[PDB]
Design a binder for this molecule. Structure first.
Ligand SMILES: [Zn+2]
Ligand SMILES: [Zn+2]
Ligand SMILES: [Zn+2]
Ligand SMILES: [Zn+2]
Lengths: 96, 98
């Protein structure tokens, strides 16, 4: 992108936190690894495309010699094309 | 069932102190921010606001990506947030025609 901000964006203000004890009760297409179709464990995230996979799953795909992102087929050179996502794991720890 | 206050730390932008709106992620360290927050910030820094890692040698915008998955989670988990943000946009545009 150019990362240009719209008129609305240029003046937007924060969405403040909900700080009451409101509890929460669908997240499959977000916290699920697309390889094993299980819930993400030790999430690894592609740098170029921000697609998330279990560490063991994506390392396995790459080790097989397929150097494509399983989600979007973008070139992945190696595991240095990937970052650990501890903050995604942490979210998953609390929700499940 | 989960307390939203238990989730908030994972859904909140440090640059505005509010929930992620158009969550945008620095690819070098994977820290995430609202789009508007991080774009404005990176006008005057090439280092992550949270961990100080270099975002890019010279052009930090090269190394951010919209994080649709994270934003989708945010809007699905935070009651009212999406409706609220959509309303703010309509309200803005009704008072500011094109
Ligand atoms: Zn997996
Ligand atoms: Zn991808
Ligand atoms: Zn923000
Ligand atoms: Zn960082």
């Amino acid at each position: 992108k150019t990362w240009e901000l719209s008129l609305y964006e240029l003046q937007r203000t924060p969405q403040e936190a909900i700080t009451d004890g409101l509890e929460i009760v669908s997240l499959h297409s977000e916290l699920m690894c697309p390889i094993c179709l299980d819930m993400l464990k030790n999430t690894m995230t592609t740098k170029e495309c921000l697609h998330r996979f279990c560490a063991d799953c994506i390392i396995t795909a790459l080790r097989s010699g397929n150097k494509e992102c399983p989600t979007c087929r973008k070139k992945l050179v190696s595991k240095r094309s990937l970052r650990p996502d501890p903050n995604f794991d942490a979210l998953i720890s609390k929700i499940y | 069932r989960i307390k939203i206050t238990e989730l908030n730390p994972h859904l909140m932008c440090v640059l505005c102190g509010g929930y992620f709106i158009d969550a945008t992620t620095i690819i070098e360290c994977l820290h995430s921010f609202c789009k508007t927050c991080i774009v404005r910030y990176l006008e005057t820094s090439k280092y992550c606001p949270i961990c100080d890692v270099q975002v890019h040698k010279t052009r930090p915008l090269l190394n951010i990506r919209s994080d649709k998955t994270l934003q989708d989670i945010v809007y699905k988990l935070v009651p009212g947030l999406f409706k609220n943000e959509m309303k703010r946009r309509r309200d803005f545009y009704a008072a500011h025609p094109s």
